[PDB]
Structure formats: C-alpha cells, structure tokens
Ligand binder design. Structure first.
Ligand SMILES: COc1ccc(S(=O)(=O)N(CC(C)C)C[C@H](O)[C@H](Cc2ccccc2)NC(=O)c2ccc3c(c2)[C@@H](N)CCO3)cc1
Lengths: 99, 99
C-alpha cells in the first residue's frame, strides 16, 4: 500500500494471539506495545522519549502479523499510551519513506 | 527520495536562521524541536509522549527548509531528546509510507 500522512498511519497487527491497532512510527528505533501478556523470558530495559524515561520489558524474537504479513523481531512491552511499530519491524515489511 | 529504515531517517533542516539535524517521524503529529528561539509569539501547550505529558511552546507559521524544500507550519518547542519532524510538515513534503 501507499499511506499518506494527513492522518495517523495506523495499521492492524496481531501479536500474542490478539488483534490490535498500532502506529507505524519511523521515529521509533524499536517496537513498543502497551502492557499485555506475552510468554517467555524478557529483560528489563530503559527507553527515553518526550515524557522522559520509561522502563519496558524486552522480548526477543516475537512473531507479529502486520497487515497480514508475518514479521519477527524484538518487542518492548511497557506503559506506552499507544502501540508503536518501530523501524526494527518496518524494515521487515520493506517499508519506505517517499517524497 | 526513497528512504529505507535500516537506519534513523535523519535530515538537516534550516529553521530560525540555524542549521539543525532532525528525525523524520510518522509517529509525531506535530513537529517538536529542542529549546531554540523562533520568530513570532507562542502559546503554551501540553503534549503527550511515551513518558507522559510535557509543557511546550507552540509557534505558528514558522518557515522551515527541509531537503531542498520550503514549508511552513506550527512548530512546538520543548523538552524533546531529539528534534523531530512530524506529520504536519511531512504532508507538505508529500511524504508517504510504502510497503
Ligand atoms: C528504542 O525504542 C524506542 C521507541 C520509541 C520511542 S518514543 O516513542 O519515545 N519516540 C522517540 C522520539 C523521536 C520522541 C518516537 C515516537 O515518534 C513518539 C511515539 C508516541 C506517539 C504517541 C504517543 C506516545 C508516543 N511520538 C511522540 O513522542 C510525539 C511527538 C509529537 C507529538 C505527539 C507525540 C502527540 N502526543 C502530541 C503532539 O505531537 C523511544 C525509543
């Protein structure tokens, strides 16, 4: 698809069995999801953004379906107010910024 | 330009007389710059990032030069870790996301 930016670039994802909405975010190094239940070991991590620093849980090699395409990568889980799809997964969709 | 996302999409911009590096950010509704002094008056505004809400200054009708392009819009100034270009300016560039 081609997605313009007159509104938020929001897509449907499926992770941990659940369908969710998420934001395609070229400013995010990594993918950050709102608190949910995910299986497997994780490791604590700190990320920094506009509101300061937040503590997230880092999950490795987590499968995520984005608009029907299965990708896999690191997923951070924590108290973000919005599900965010980072570059680490957008590369795997073959996604580009065009102007 | 077609920009892949294997690395951060950084561009040089010219604003308020000054040359600066900023991040192309589809997850940002609005453009946000670190403390700067801009032409014109501002009003207070609260914006919400990954760590919570923060007070910024909203300047309207700020001209900005981005990748050989001239644009003009609202620029927010406040405690952001990195300068970010939001959708409000990227639409003026004609940016799209493409899978
Ligand atoms: C290592 O992985 C990460 C991933 C994401 C982040 S981040 O979310 O903190 N962020 C990094 C910088 C560029 C600020 C990138 C996103 O662009 C960020 C995501 C977000 C969107 C909505 C709500 C919370 C977070 N976007 C913004 O901070 C942002 C930027 C501008 C903006 C708004 C938000 C609106 N809430 C109000 C007006 O304009 C940091 C580290």
């Amino acid at each position: 698809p081609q997605i313009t930016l007159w509104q938020r670039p929001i897509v449907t994802i499926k992770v941990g069995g659940q369908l969710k909405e998420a934001l395609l975010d070229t400013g995010a190094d990594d993918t950050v999801l709102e608190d949910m239940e995910l299986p497997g070991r994780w490791k604590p991590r700190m990320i920094g953004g506009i509101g300061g620093f937040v503590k997230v849980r880092q999950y490795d090699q987590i499968p995520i379906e984005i608009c029907g395409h299965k990708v896999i990568g690191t997923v951070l889980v924590g108290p973000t107010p919005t599900n965010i799809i980072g570059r680490n997964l957008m590369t795997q969709l073959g996604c580009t910024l065009n102007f």
